[PDB]
Design a protein around this nucleic acid. Structure first.
Ligand code: NA
Ligand code: NA
Length: 327
DNA sequence: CATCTG
DNA sequence: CAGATG
């Protein structure tokens, strides 16, 4: 956790690079298990040889660790942190809509920057375009003080369209958190579930409303059960307009809300622990359901949940307020 | 995993 | 349809 920190860090840099710049999924993946294992490792790695001793730890990595341990640096890391091409790719990638793949193409065409991008808006697709338009706004965290305003809006409009809708804003927003990265809304309705054959309107109706009133500004992606967009808290009495924010809306069959809801609320750490306990308690849990574990090895059969309560209860645990859902 | 692009 | 992005 700090005893093999550098090592794990460099290793991650390395891993990252393989995958983003070179295409080296293998390699990339190589650095990963490597960092994972050293990461758990209980002692002060004092040399390569020592490390090699670990699994996932081969000769090349060991080499690397030596140099790094031998000197505060590593040539290769040295070379990569410079290289404009490598740099460019890490940057282009910041645009929502541009992945590594794309980042590669673009550079090989000479687009290496923001201006490059504006100049070549033609080559970008709609998502990518938006991404570019809101480059700044998108990188700006979302303060709770805004979150609550947003939330206040979304829930009121959902309410109007149908009393039966049920919306929840998961995320750390839900776990307390002072600011957040984007707004995540879990959606359901009684008239939609597991078996119930579809109802796309269910999602589209709301989406519309939200744009009705202009809370929703652009559509990133809009499918039948997942909508990816851009919203914005109306600028008050003109002088201070708000940054454009990412927002997602997703339909969930009622029969599987809370697991989902539980799930999205995190933290990842909370999940796992709960997850493992469920396991002890003779259970199974994932995104959509909680199942009674048979002994034969495995087994299923969706236990029935009416709230986040039903779940814990099942695994016979202490109901946890979202705030304490931390780890 | 769901959506998009081409 | 593969293949990319979130
Ligand atoms: Na991106
Ligand atoms: Na292939």
């Amino acid at each position: 956790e700090t005893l093999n920190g550098g090592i794990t860090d460099m290793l991650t840099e390395l891993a990252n690079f393989e995958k983003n710049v070179s295409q080296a999924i293998h390699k990339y993946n190589a650095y990963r298990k490597a960092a994972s294992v050293i990461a758990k490792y209980p002692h002060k790695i004092k040399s390569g040889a020592e490390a090699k001793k670990l699994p996932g730890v081969g000769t090349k990595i060991a080499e690397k660790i030596d140099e790094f341990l031998a000197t505060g640096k590593l040539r290769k890391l040295e070379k990569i942190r410079q290289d404009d091409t490598s740099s460019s790719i890490n940057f282009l990638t910041r645009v929502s809509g541009i992945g590594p793949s794309a980042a590669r193409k673009f550079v090989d065409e000479g687009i290496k920057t923001l201006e490059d991008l504006r100049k070549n808006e033609d080559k970008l697709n709609h998502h990518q375009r938006i991404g570019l338009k809101y480059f700044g706004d998108f990188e700006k965290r979302i303060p709770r003080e805004e979150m609550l305003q947003m939330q206040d809006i979304v829930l009121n409009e959902v309410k109007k369209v149908d009393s039966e809708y049920i919306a929840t804003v998961c995320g750390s927003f839900r776990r307390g958190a002072e600011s957040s990265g984007d707004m995540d809304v879990l959606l359901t309705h009684p008239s939609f579930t597991s078996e119930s054959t579809k109802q796309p309107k269910l999602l589209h109706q709301v989406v519309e409303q939200l744009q009705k009133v202009h809370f929703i500004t652009d559509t990133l992606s809009k499918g039948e059960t997942k909508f990816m967009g851009v919203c914005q808290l109306p600028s008050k009495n003109d002088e201070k307009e708000y940054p454009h924010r990412r927002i997602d809306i997703r339909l969930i069959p009622k029969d599987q809300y809370y697991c989902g809801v539980l799930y999205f609320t995190g933290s990842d750490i909370f999940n796992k622990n709960m997850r493992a306990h469920a396991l002890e308690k003779g259970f199974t849990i994932n995104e959509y359901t909680i199942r009674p574990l048979g002994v034969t090895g495995v087994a299923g059969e969706p236990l029935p949940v009416d709230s986040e309560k039903d779940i814990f209860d099942y695994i016979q645990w202490k109901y946890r307020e979202p705030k304490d859902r931390s780890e």
